[PDB]
Amino acid sequence: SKQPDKQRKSQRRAPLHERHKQVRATLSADLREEYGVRVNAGDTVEVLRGDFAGEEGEVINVDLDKAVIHVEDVTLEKTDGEEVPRPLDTSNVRVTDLDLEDEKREARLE
Amino acid sequence: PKMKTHKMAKRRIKITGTGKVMAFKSGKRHQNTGKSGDEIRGKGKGFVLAKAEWARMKLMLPR
Amino acid sequence: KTQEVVSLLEALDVHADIDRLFVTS
RNA sequence: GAGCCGGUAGCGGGCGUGGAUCCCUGGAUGUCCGAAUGGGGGAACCCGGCCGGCGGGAACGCCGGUCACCGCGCUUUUGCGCGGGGGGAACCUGGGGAACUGAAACAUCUCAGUACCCAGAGGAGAGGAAAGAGAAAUCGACUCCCUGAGUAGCGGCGAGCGAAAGGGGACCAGCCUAAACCGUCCGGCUUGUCCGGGCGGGGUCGUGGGGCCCUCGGACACCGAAUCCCCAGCCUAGCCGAAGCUGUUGGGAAGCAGCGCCAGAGAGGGUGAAAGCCCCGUAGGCGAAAGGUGGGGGGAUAGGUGAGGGUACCCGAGUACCCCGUGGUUCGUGGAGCCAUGGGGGAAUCUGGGCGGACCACCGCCUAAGGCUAAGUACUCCGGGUGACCGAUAGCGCACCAGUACCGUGAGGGAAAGGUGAAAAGAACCCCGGGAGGGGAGUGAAAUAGAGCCUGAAACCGUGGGCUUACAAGCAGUCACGGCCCCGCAAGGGGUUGUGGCGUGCCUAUUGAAGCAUGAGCCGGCGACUCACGGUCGUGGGCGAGCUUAAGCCGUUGAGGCGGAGGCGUAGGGAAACCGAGUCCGAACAGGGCGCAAAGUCCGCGGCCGUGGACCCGAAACCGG
RNA sequence: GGGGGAUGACCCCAGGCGGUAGGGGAGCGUUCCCGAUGCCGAUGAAGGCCGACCCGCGAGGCGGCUGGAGGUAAGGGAAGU
RNA sequence: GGACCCGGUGAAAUUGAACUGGCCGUGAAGAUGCGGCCUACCCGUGGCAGGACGAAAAGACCCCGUGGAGCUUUACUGCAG
Known part of the structure; x- marks a missing residue:
C-alpha cells in the first residue's frame, strides 16, 4: 500500500470488510462529537449532496458490495413506472439517529 | 576506448x-644498395608534413 | 514542538519565509 | 465485523453477531496423463499377483484398498533399510564447440572460447591457506569493484588482440585426511615380523609427524555447520488513527463568499466540475499472533586444537622430470618459461624436491603428485518501491472468455480489438413494418451521450443552395477587365468565373529532363544522423599545479560531504647506455630535435574522429540446432 | 565595413544579396522536468470546426460554433520532434 | 454457348493529376500538355485494334560489385582414407 492501484488491492480484493472500511463516516451532533468509534451500517442519516442534497432518510441496505448503499428516501422511479431505491454514493452519507435500539447497536457505536 | x-608507433x-613528429631518414639503404657512399650520409631523419595528422592522431594519447 | 514553530514564527513571517528552509547545526 | 452462495446482473431457494462472506497458516481428501516406474501402449487408455468387504450375491458372488520399475549404498545372511533421478525465464562452471564479417582479396588472424548443443552443482555456483608472486631480502587465501594499462607485449609486426605483481576498496578465516612410525586388532598367508581394513597417535597452514630419554604441565580458545528460546524478518488480513459548516452560481460542488479547526502525518487516489479538514484502514505514529525462515547474540553444547630440548632414522600420493605432439597464457613456432596434459621412457623423502621465464654458477622463494571451506561479485520467474517511461499502430507482441482466433503436416508463425453515463435511470406504452429499423412519449444537464453508444478530423459517397457550363485546352493557373450573388470588421472586400495576356506537372538519380526514366491511385497515423566509452578542436566557466576514480559515511525532500592509488601538464634529446635546459651523428664546434615558460587542467555544452547493428530498410549466401 | 550609437534606434554610401552538394549564424512550433519569493478553467482545460488584427517566416493572438474534463508555464533545462 | 437488351448479385492488377485531336517542327534527339497551323459542339452504349513508349516483372541477353552458389584438372592449401 504505497502506490496508486494498491488501493483496489487491499480494499476489495482483500477482506471485503475492508470495504466496511468504506461504510466509514460520522453523523449528527449527539453521537458524533460524542466520539465516532463503533459503527452500525444500516443506520439512518440524510445525505448532504446531489440535488437530493440536504435530505431526510434512513439506512436500508449494507451494500458494501456494490461499494455503496441505499437509503429508502433517496431513490427514483423507472420509466415503465414503479418507484425504486437509487444507488447510494458512499460519498455523501449522513447518520444521526444511530441505529442502536438493538442492544448490540448501543454496545458498539453509541 | x-x-x-601501435605499429608505426613502433x-x-x-x-x-x-x-x-618525425621518423629516421629512409632513402634506400638497409636492403639493396651497393650503390655509393655519400649517399649513405643519407640517413638521419625525415619529417613529412600534412599527413603527419592521421599519424600523430591515430597514435595520440601516450606518444 | 512543531507549534513552537507557529511561534518563533509569528516572530518574523512574510513571503520570504514562504521560501524557508530549515536547518540546525 | 456484520453481510453472503465466486466473474452472472436472471429465475428458484437458502447461511448467518449461543464470533457467516472472506483474509492466514497447518490439514485431510488430491479422479487420469506426465520422470511413471506393476505390465503394455498410437499420453490422458487397456492388461496382471496379495489382502480386502465378504459384497445385489431378492431363491445368487465385486469394486475398493493394495502392491510390486530401475540404476544407489550396504547387516553381506534369503540382501533388509537409505539417496537419486524430472523440472525450471535468467544467471554458474565443466564437456564439446562454427562460419559469416573485419584484414577494404583471402589460406595466417578476427569475430571467440562467442552463438549453439551436452552434462551437471547451487541458490548462488567459480574459486579458495600457495612446489604462489616478484625482487625494495618486498609481498602473502580465494573472489569481486576501481586502478595498474589500452601501458609491458603477441603478430602475413597488417587488421586487431591486449596481461600481471604492486596501491586504493568490499570481505575476512580457518581446517583436514593415505599420509605405516606407534600401538589396537580383524582377516588371510599359512605362525611370525606379509599384505589387509575398521580404532586412535599424528591425523603437518607458512615444515614437520612419530618413537626414546629428563623440563612438561596441573580451567574461558566456540564453527561451514550443531543448539536454545532471543529481536526469531517476513508470511495476508493487524488498527487506531487531527480538524469546518452555513451561505451560494450550479443537473451536479469539495468551486465563489463568510467566518472555523488540524499539523512529526499539504504522499497521491476515490468523491456527480480543482477539499489538509467529504471518503481514503496513507503517509504522524504506535500497533499486532498460537504455526513457516535467518543473522545479530547469550550460554554451555563446543567439535576442536593449544609448551622443552635430543637422536644414526622411517612418514601426502600413481608420472616430477625428460623427448615428441597440442592447450591456456599478452606469446601466432618463436632466444620462449611456468602450470595443464596426447604417446614413451619411469627419480629423489629435508644437504630431498620445483621455482624466480634457454641454459649455468651463486643467492632468494616455496614445500606439491588427496580433500571441505560461509562472507565480499552475477542473475531476475517471483513481491515491493521509484520514473525529465509510455498511452492504445506507443509499451511486453498480448490492459483482460490472446501465445487464443488464423495459415503451417511439423518445428514454428502469430493478430486485431479498450473508452456511454453520475449512476443505467438502459428506454414500459402508442405508431409504419415480415422484422431490422425508423416516429412520438419518458429518463435527462446534453442523447447530432443512445447501446460497439466519449473526443468522434481527413479521404470518400450523398441532399439543397449561390455562381457557372455546348464553335471549346489544360493539372495548373496566375495578372487585367467585365456581369451575377452576399456586404457581423459597409463607398472596401467576399465567391464564382466570360474573355484575353503570359505559362511544360512533382519528386529521386542525372552532361542534361515536360517528361516517354523512375518514385507515387487517395486520405490519416508509424517511419530514418541517435546513445555510450574513448579521442578530437571550439567554446562557458572554476583554480594554475589543475582534477577525479571505486568506496566509506549522510540520506519524506531523501542534503552531499569526506575518499588522494592514479592520470594528463612540471624540460626534453636519444635505439640505448645515459646526459640533461641541453642533447644526439661524430670526433666535430656544420646540422636534426628542442630551450626560449605564455602554463594547463577539470568540467559543461557543441562541429567531428574510432569502436560499436550505429543515418534507415534492401538481396543472392555461409555457418548451428 | 565604417562615422556617434542611451538599451532601443536613427543618418550616409560603400556595398552586394540567384544558388543544389556543402560550410558558418539566427529563429519556429512538438511532448516532457522546473512551478529560478510562477498557477488559468464549468460564465470550458484540450483537441476540434471557421476567420479580410500580429510576423520576412516557421507561428502567433483573438473572436464565433463544438466538447467534457484538464493543465498552462513569464525561463532555463531535456529529447523516441 | 457467351457476348447484347431485363431483373438479382457484384471483383479484380495499373494508376502523381488530368477537361488527353491531326499536322509539320521541336526538346534528351520516335510528344494529346512546347511553336506555328487546320479541323474542332456536349455526352454516351455495340465494336476495331493503332498510340498513350500501354499492364505483368526494380531483363534472365549485357557489362560493373577485389557479390554468391554448383561441377571440373598438372590451380593454392589442407583433411578424410
Whole structure:
C-alpha cells in the first residue's frame, strides 16, 4: 500500500470488510462529537449532496458490495413506472439517529 | 576506448612537444644498395608534413 | 514542538519565509 | 465485523453477531496423463499377483484398498533399510564447440572460447591457506569493484588482440585426511615380523609427524555447520488513527463568499466540475499472533586444537622430470618459461624436491603428485518501491472468455480489438413494418451521450443552395477587365468565373529532363544522423599545479560531504647506455630535435574522429540446432 | 565595413544579396522536468470546426460554433520532434 | 454457348493529376500538355485494334560489385582414407 492501484488491492480484493472500511463516516451532533468509534451500517442519516442534497432518510441496505448503499428516501422511479431505491454514493452519507435500539447497536457505536 | 597502429608507433614515429613528429631518414639503404657512399650520409631523419595528422592522431594519447 | 514553530514564527513571517528552509547545526 | 452462495446482473431457494462472506497458516481428501516406474501402449487408455468387504450375491458372488520399475549404498545372511533421478525465464562452471564479417582479396588472424548443443552443482555456483608472486631480502587465501594499462607485449609486426605483481576498496578465516612410525586388532598367508581394513597417535597452514630419554604441565580458545528460546524478518488480513459548516452560481460542488479547526502525518487516489479538514484502514505514529525462515547474540553444547630440548632414522600420493605432439597464457613456432596434459621412457623423502621465464654458477622463494571451506561479485520467474517511461499502430507482441482466433503436416508463425453515463435511470406504452429499423412519449444537464453508444478530423459517397457550363485546352493557373450573388470588421472586400495576356506537372538519380526514366491511385497515423566509452578542436566557466576514480559515511525532500592509488601538464634529446635546459651523428664546434615558460587542467555544452547493428530498410549466401 | 550609437534606434554610401552538394549564424512550433519569493478553467482545460488584427517566416493572438474534463508555464533545462 | 437488351448479385492488377485531336517542327534527339497551323459542339452504349513508349516483372541477353552458389584438372592449401 504505497502506490496508486494498491488501493483496489487491499480494499476489495482483500477482506471485503475492508470495504466496511468504506461504510466509514460520522453523523449528527449527539453521537458524533460524542466520539465516532463503533459503527452500525444500516443506520439512518440524510445525505448532504446531489440535488437530493440536504435530505431526510434512513439506512436500508449494507451494500458494501456494490461499494455503496441505499437509503429508502433517496431513490427514483423507472420509466415503465414503479418507484425504486437509487444507488447510494458512499460519498455523501449522513447518520444521526444511530441505529442502536438493538442492544448490540448501543454496545458498539453509541 | 583507444589504441593506435601501435605499429608505426613502433617503427618510424614519435613527436616533439612542438606538436610535431618525425621518423629516421629512409632513402634506400638497409636492403639493396651497393650503390655509393655519400649517399649513405643519407640517413638521419625525415619529417613529412600534412599527413603527419592521421599519424600523430591515430597514435595520440601516450606518444 | 512543531507549534513552537507557529511561534518563533509569528516572530518574523512574510513571503520570504514562504521560501524557508530549515536547518540546525 | 456484520453481510453472503465466486466473474452472472436472471429465475428458484437458502447461511448467518449461543464470533457467516472472506483474509492466514497447518490439514485431510488430491479422479487420469506426465520422470511413471506393476505390465503394455498410437499420453490422458487397456492388461496382471496379495489382502480386502465378504459384497445385489431378492431363491445368487465385486469394486475398493493394495502392491510390486530401475540404476544407489550396504547387516553381506534369503540382501533388509537409505539417496537419486524430472523440472525450471535468467544467471554458474565443466564437456564439446562454427562460419559469416573485419584484414577494404583471402589460406595466417578476427569475430571467440562467442552463438549453439551436452552434462551437471547451487541458490548462488567459480574459486579458495600457495612446489604462489616478484625482487625494495618486498609481498602473502580465494573472489569481486576501481586502478595498474589500452601501458609491458603477441603478430602475413597488417587488421586487431591486449596481461600481471604492486596501491586504493568490499570481505575476512580457518581446517583436514593415505599420509605405516606407534600401538589396537580383524582377516588371510599359512605362525611370525606379509599384505589387509575398521580404532586412535599424528591425523603437518607458512615444515614437520612419530618413537626414546629428563623440563612438561596441573580451567574461558566456540564453527561451514550443531543448539536454545532471543529481536526469531517476513508470511495476508493487524488498527487506531487531527480538524469546518452555513451561505451560494450550479443537473451536479469539495468551486465563489463568510467566518472555523488540524499539523512529526499539504504522499497521491476515490468523491456527480480543482477539499489538509467529504471518503481514503496513507503517509504522524504506535500497533499486532498460537504455526513457516535467518543473522545479530547469550550460554554451555563446543567439535576442536593449544609448551622443552635430543637422536644414526622411517612418514601426502600413481608420472616430477625428460623427448615428441597440442592447450591456456599478452606469446601466432618463436632466444620462449611456468602450470595443464596426447604417446614413451619411469627419480629423489629435508644437504630431498620445483621455482624466480634457454641454459649455468651463486643467492632468494616455496614445500606439491588427496580433500571441505560461509562472507565480499552475477542473475531476475517471483513481491515491493521509484520514473525529465509510455498511452492504445506507443509499451511486453498480448490492459483482460490472446501465445487464443488464423495459415503451417511439423518445428514454428502469430493478430486485431479498450473508452456511454453520475449512476443505467438502459428506454414500459402508442405508431409504419415480415422484422431490422425508423416516429412520438419518458429518463435527462446534453442523447447530432443512445447501446460497439466519449473526443468522434481527413479521404470518400450523398441532399439543397449561390455562381457557372455546348464553335471549346489544360493539372495548373496566375495578372487585367467585365456581369451575377452576399456586404457581423459597409463607398472596401467576399465567391464564382466570360474573355484575353503570359505559362511544360512533382519528386529521386542525372552532361542534361515536360517528361516517354523512375518514385507515387487517395486520405490519416508509424517511419530514418541517435546513445555510450574513448579521442578530437571550439567554446562557458572554476583554480594554475589543475582534477577525479571505486568506496566509506549522510540520506519524506531523501542534503552531499569526506575518499588522494592514479592520470594528463612540471624540460626534453636519444635505439640505448645515459646526459640533461641541453642533447644526439661524430670526433666535430656544420646540422636534426628542442630551450626560449605564455602554463594547463577539470568540467559543461557543441562541429567531428574510432569502436560499436550505429543515418534507415534492401538481396543472392555461409555457418548451428 | 565604417562615422556617434542611451538599451532601443536613427543618418550616409560603400556595398552586394540567384544558388543544389556543402560550410558558418539566427529563429519556429512538438511532448516532457522546473512551478529560478510562477498557477488559468464549468460564465470550458484540450483537441476540434471557421476567420479580410500580429510576423520576412516557421507561428502567433483573438473572436464565433463544438466538447467534457484538464493543465498552462513569464525561463532555463531535456529529447523516441 | 457467351457476348447484347431485363431483373438479382457484384471483383479484380495499373494508376502523381488530368477537361488527353491531326499536322509539320521541336526538346534528351520516335510528344494529346512546347511553336506555328487546320479541323474542332456536349455526352454516351455495340465494336476495331493503332498510340498513350500501354499492364505483368526494380531483363534472365549485357557489362560493373577485389557479390554468391554448383561441377571440373598438372590451380593454392589442407583433411578424410
